[PDB]
Amino acid sequence: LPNITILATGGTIAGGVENLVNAVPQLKDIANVKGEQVVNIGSQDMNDNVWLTLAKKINTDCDKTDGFVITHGTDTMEETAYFLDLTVKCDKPVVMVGAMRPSTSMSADGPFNLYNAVVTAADKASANRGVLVVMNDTVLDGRDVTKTNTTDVATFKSVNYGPLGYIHNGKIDYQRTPARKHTSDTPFDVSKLNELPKVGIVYNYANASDLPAKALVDAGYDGIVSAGVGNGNLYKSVFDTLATAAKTGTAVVRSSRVPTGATTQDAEVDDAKYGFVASGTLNPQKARVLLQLALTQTKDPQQIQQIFNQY
Amino acid sequence: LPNITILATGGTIAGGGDSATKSNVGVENLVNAVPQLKDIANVKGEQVVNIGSQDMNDNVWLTLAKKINTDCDKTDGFVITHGTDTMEETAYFLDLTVKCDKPVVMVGAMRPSTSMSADGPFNLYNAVVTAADKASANRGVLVVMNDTVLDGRDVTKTNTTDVATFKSVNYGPLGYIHNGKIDYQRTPARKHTSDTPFDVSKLNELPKVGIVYNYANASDLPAKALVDAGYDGIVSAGVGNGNLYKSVFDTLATAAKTGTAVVRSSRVPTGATTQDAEVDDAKYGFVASGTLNPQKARVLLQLALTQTKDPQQIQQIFNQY
Amino acid sequence: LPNITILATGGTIAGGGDSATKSNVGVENLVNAVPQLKDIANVKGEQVVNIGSQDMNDNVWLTLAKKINTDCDKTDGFVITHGTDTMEETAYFLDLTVKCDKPVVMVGAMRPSTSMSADGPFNLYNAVVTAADKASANRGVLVVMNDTVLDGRDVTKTNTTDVATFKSVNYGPLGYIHNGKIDYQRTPARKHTSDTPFDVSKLNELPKVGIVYNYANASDLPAKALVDAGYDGIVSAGVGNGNLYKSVFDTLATAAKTGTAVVRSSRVPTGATTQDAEVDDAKYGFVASGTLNPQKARVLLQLALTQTKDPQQIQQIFNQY
Amino acid sequence: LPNITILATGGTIAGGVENLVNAVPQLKDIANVKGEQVVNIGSQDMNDNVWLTLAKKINTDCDKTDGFVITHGTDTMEETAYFLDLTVKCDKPVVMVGAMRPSTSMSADGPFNLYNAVVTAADKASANRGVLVVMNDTVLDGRDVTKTNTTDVATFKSVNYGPLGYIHNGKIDYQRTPARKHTSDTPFDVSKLNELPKVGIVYNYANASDLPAKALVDAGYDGIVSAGVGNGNLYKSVFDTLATAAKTGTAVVRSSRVPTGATTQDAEVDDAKYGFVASGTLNPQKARVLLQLALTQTKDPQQIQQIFNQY
């Protein structure tokens, strides 16, 4: 059976980490499982330092195991998954998993989610598909996956392009793979980084204040992601503040608060005139992930736009 | 035929039929752009304001509510043409502040009126059908898009470009439109229009309420900037079931005990931010938004703050409207 | 605490808590498999029948309706445990024939009770919560699955394996359940339970109604076989908005003028099969099903045929229930 | 500009076929369009003879054009699309398109759907993705696409695995391609066939009659697809009739009336014992398509099951 490493970032999702094989004994029939506690935080407190720790650990320990499962809180799992999708260089499956119900609650979803995550990490067909999220019997790619509902066990969906495969009786039928470049096909190399460029997110809505945007600019933030209205549009005072900042060198990415679809180039904002970048199907928190990593390579809006077109 | 007033807030959502007859109009041309409006209503148009909906603001909201409430006895129903980007916010504001019980229907277009297969003309026709239907009364303010009647509280823009973008993502639509007929199977249970206490006829401004986003390694600077500006309320677009990044939590905990109303909503597009989850709202003086997303929670918080600053009373408001 | 009766129609959807105490139950063990039922209700269980729901039939339907109507005054609410494959059919049959106004809630499980992360226990808990809630009365027969309360008319199985499969795909759910509390925001407008004329207490059989599928190059032999057997009604699972393959159309046109009731439904999983579309129903004597899918249209057609054979009166029934 | 052939099977969807460039003049700016009327029927009357005509025409005329657009009624478009997905051997885009509103109705969707279908057929990136359906600004694969709503212009969706790309301003961002084998990677060759094996569909529901199933068996049908309940289950009397028929050599495929998900092997029916085949994510009408073509190659249930696992 394959050697699978479980990297935990918080509390247990079934039934500490070295006792998962006794909480889910059926794991022993599909893998030899070894567990390590990397951090212990709630995922609402996820941060850049944990991201760097996780990427470096996977890239360092790749040769010591056949696949990785990362147990993670659901709140920010979609952000961590995409960060690792862009920075992991390991050739072996990396699978993120969580639980929408507490492990001690009735009909807890964690045990079977963990089982199916280990199935996915052990499947030779899972390799070269990027970093994966496995939730509710489904294999999802780290780029498009997002939390769609605040409480449903079925909350995680790839809302623009769909799942990669479904799991039944411990077997996966993969019918899709992400076309955007991931893992060893990206230039992002965080092995020597102690920190990431500073990128914040501002919301747009009727009568929106420019004060949040101005505060990030005044703090010297390297980039700002706009959660715009509709197809990435901005309330006038927010636009004005971000347009001035882009002329001073702040990177500005237009995303959307709208939960599906793409913030497109060639719409109602002349991005080239203002020095802005359109996020495509990346939602604001995912756009932040790629913008931070883009800013490790370049500050030029045309080159950042090309990054947002390839990854 | 019913008298229907169209209130325009921006550009035309339907064009055509405007060839001149003299050798030598705007909203008044809609009866020529969509000539079959004649079959279903007596239409009169007024241009209230002309702005893109990404620049929607409190002043336009107050103008619309006051106009509808003042002109209720002069017409049988209202249609408001509005940009799609913030329609869901205006719809809910009017849902809470309109006291006319005659139908008020909002409508827009996801394709330009000059484009191939423009959706505006048929959307406008169906909006007038809805405003003319006696069965549409007493259901609150409505949004009519893509052959569907949606209630103003739950309706939201779900896709950046699709003509089918507007959905009531938690509780579903009220009715579907086919061949100019509506089969209504639902009505909102939350209190609306004349069953709310919100009365803005005499108000010239609304309490200041801003929105902050949560994500990994979120800065507290947006929240701090609102607090420094003396904002009356702050809505948090939380992660998951309304949770907060530690730095943002710290600032909002301070703000809630120092005279700021704090509502926990969620960046997650469906589902409720609940009480009795993983944030002790009673300890911190916070309010949970329920199924109201951040921009909709801002609407209700602004209006709540015209009545009260007490967090327990604001929570009751968020449990009733 | 309310008295809640559980009527089981098959295997247990929750297990455990059954260790013996003597050195030397089935549905009666559910209070041990889900011990927190004690916190919310006084539960008594009866095994009505024991079958897989793919073998559901008219006799079980009649038994359930009669039992609920007979035992209504002996309890405060009912929960029916049922297989998922045909739950949506039984739910609608009971929605039309139950005359008790106390809550009747159906519940099932998409994972075996012995499996990892089995959904049955929490589904049953939430079903009892719903049946015990005074607010659940007068909303018709309900289905409670995956923390959601769904009305029996619109609820359908949308996925072959997902625990979240049951959805009200046209008009949405009535309420969501969190921490043992329901926030109801909707109720069905179509007439149900004591507002219908359908009374099956004295009936030992139901009219014969079959379903035929439409597709490219569809054979007329299924339809002809029903007609030859003297079926009282035939439901067509049409293509698109209720359309029929030419050979099937020919047979059903003949059947409708020769004493068979013919209802046009659709294999398409959401939306209505409408009147005034591309099938002249008046000319052919057909009835359009609206949002009722084929198996749900069969339920209403069977019951319509206990009252009338007249296609105009059956159409009115399909417009009211 | 590319040469695009429009093959019409019914009435016009914009504004006969030789006049589409004047109904949608913007087509002239993206392609040189030539139109042919192959048949003129409503798609509710679609049939095997039209399917054979279309496949042979595309395979014969492949060298004479750069891509194909087929105008088709929406009712059975998902069946024709999958038939062609399995039988077209041409290396050039084949794109199906229709309209949910009449061409003479307000806000008719046909004109822009046709424009976007020609965009897709002209895009070099559309090749080698199988037969496509283009509806409501979206490119969908012929296998998974299905009509989800009776009237909505947005009705067509790939409900299990998602779309291949979205179209904005005449440009497509493809992020997916079907993994199941299609077009020139299948063995199905209809170039010399005058007819297809007889395959019918029976519905399952409470108290279901076995008489439809028995009628198809008595007519000597080569195959029967069951629209089962849940995960492909059958009402007892239908099961019994189909089990007896399978022992006599009738091919029997279990599908489901449930609109998403897979009728799986290793569930509540012992397919190997009874000689049945599980359809996977193919719905009943799509399962019929593949079963008919399977039966041109083999009558053995294990070999038919392998076909349903590869195509």
Numbering used by the authors:
A (entry chain B), D (entry chain B): 1 to 15, 31 to 326
B (entry chain A), C (entry chain A): 1 to 24, 30 to 326
Show the paper's wording.
The bacterial enzyme is capable of deaminating l-asparagine and, with reduced efficiency, l-glutamine, to their corresponding acidic forms releasing ammonia. The functional protein is a homotetramer and each monomer (A, B, C and D) consists of two α/β domains connected by a ca. 21 amino acid-long random-coil. The molecule includes 4 active sites, buried at the intimate dimer interface and mainly built by residues located in each protomer N-domain, as the companion C-domain of the intimate dimer contributes only one residue to the catalytic centre of the enzyme (E283′). Each active site consists of two parts: a rigid one, mainly involved in substrate binding, and a flexible one, carrying two of the six residues involved in catalysis.
Here, we report for the first time the structure of E. coli type II asparaginase in its ligand-free, open conformation (APO-EcAII) at 1.6 Å resolution with clear electron density for at least one protomer active site flexible loop, comprising key residues involved in the enzyme catalysis. The asymmetric unit (ASU) comprised 4 monomers named A, B, C, and D; chains A and B and chains C and D are associated into separated intimate dimers, each representing the functional unit of l-asparaginases. The electron density (e.d.) of residues 16–30 in chain B and of residues 16–31 in chain D was unavailable, which was consistent with most of the available structures for l-asparaginase present in the PDB. However, a clear trace of e.d. was visible for the whole loop in chain C, though with a slightly lower quality for residues G16 and G17, and for most of it in chain A (missing residues: 25–29). Compared to the closed form, the active site flexible loop has been captured in different, open orientations in two chains of the new crystal structure. In chain C, it is partially bent towards the α1 helix and its residues S23 and G28 form contacts with residues A38 and N34, respectively. In chain A, the loop is even more open, and residue T21 forms a 74.5° angle with the position of the same residue of the l-Asp-bound monomer. Apart from the active site flexible loop, all the other structural elements and the catalytically relevant residues of the APO-EcAII are superposable to the corresponding elements in the EcAII-ASP structure. The oxyanion hole described for all the l-asparaginase structures solved in complex with both L-Asp and l-Glu products, which is partially built by residues contributed by the loop in its closed position, is not evident in the new APO-EcAII structure here described. Analysis of solvent in the APO-EcAII active site pocket reveals the presence of five highly coordinated water molecules (for reference: 408, 412, 446, 529, 592 in 6YZI chain C) that interact with residues involved in l-Asp binding and are present in all 4 protomers of the ASU.
